[PDB]
Design a protein that fits this description.
Blueprint: E1 17-19, E2 25-28, E3 48-49, E4 58-64, E5 71-77, E6 94-100, E7 104-107, E8 113-115, E9 123-129, E10 134-139, E11 145-150, E12 159-164, E13 177-179
Antiparallel strand pairs: 1-2, 2-13, 3-12, 4-9, 4-13, 5-6, 5-12, 6-7, 7-8, 9-10, 10-11
Bound molecules: the ligand CC(=O)c1ccc2c(c1)N(CCCN(C)C)c1ccccc1S2.
Subcellular location: Cytoplasm; Cytoplasmic vesicle, Autophagosome; Nucleus; Cytoplasm, P-body
Protein name: E3 ubiquitin-protein ligase TRIM21
GO molecular function: DNA binding; identical protein binding; RNA binding; transcription coactivator activity; ubiquitin protein ligase activity; ubiquitin-protein transferase activity; zinc ion binding
Length: 182
Amino acid sequence: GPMVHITLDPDTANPWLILSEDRRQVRLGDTQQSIPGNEERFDSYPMVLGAQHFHSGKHYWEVDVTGKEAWALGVCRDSVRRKGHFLLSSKSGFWTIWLWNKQKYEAGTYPQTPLHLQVPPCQVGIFLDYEAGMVSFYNITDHGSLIYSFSECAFTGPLRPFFSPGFNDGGKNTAPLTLCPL
Ligand SMILES: CC(=O)c1ccc2c(c1)N(CCCN(C)C)c1ccccc1S2
């Protein structure tokens, strides 16, 4: 079935992130870690990928976001640029939604799409359908209602799970993103 056990890829993790020993959780740090400047590491935002690669098929996983004032989740091409600033956009190889400022939910279309959520999600489900060209986001707290779906994605190559526990703000928002047991 589509449920997949995601683990986080340490080689991609921005130095402002702290990964748990089992690589199932990630949070913002108060200072940057001193770690290699390898080509796969996001250097400008607190972002990290899952280790898993998807070339085809249906895949599903869930993330706990309880109480966080900001986070971003989704899928991206493995080929996305890792160094420098960029637009989180489905024109740039990312299919993502996010929260910031405690109550501003947006989908990473270009331009961005505001999302009106009646129930703030505590857990989010991410469903990837490679052949259908779809990435769908579900509000587990609201009985699995649809938050947003990207369609007509027309994927090539491997895709990766994408995560951010927030941006750097002054040590705020330090609770982790946690991959839920499935
Ligand atoms: C849209 C875009 O390219 C974009 C690029 C990077 C980031 C981002 C938006 N925001 C949303 C804006 C935060 N700014 C205003 C500080 C975000 C949200 C949750 C977690 C991490 C991040 S960092």
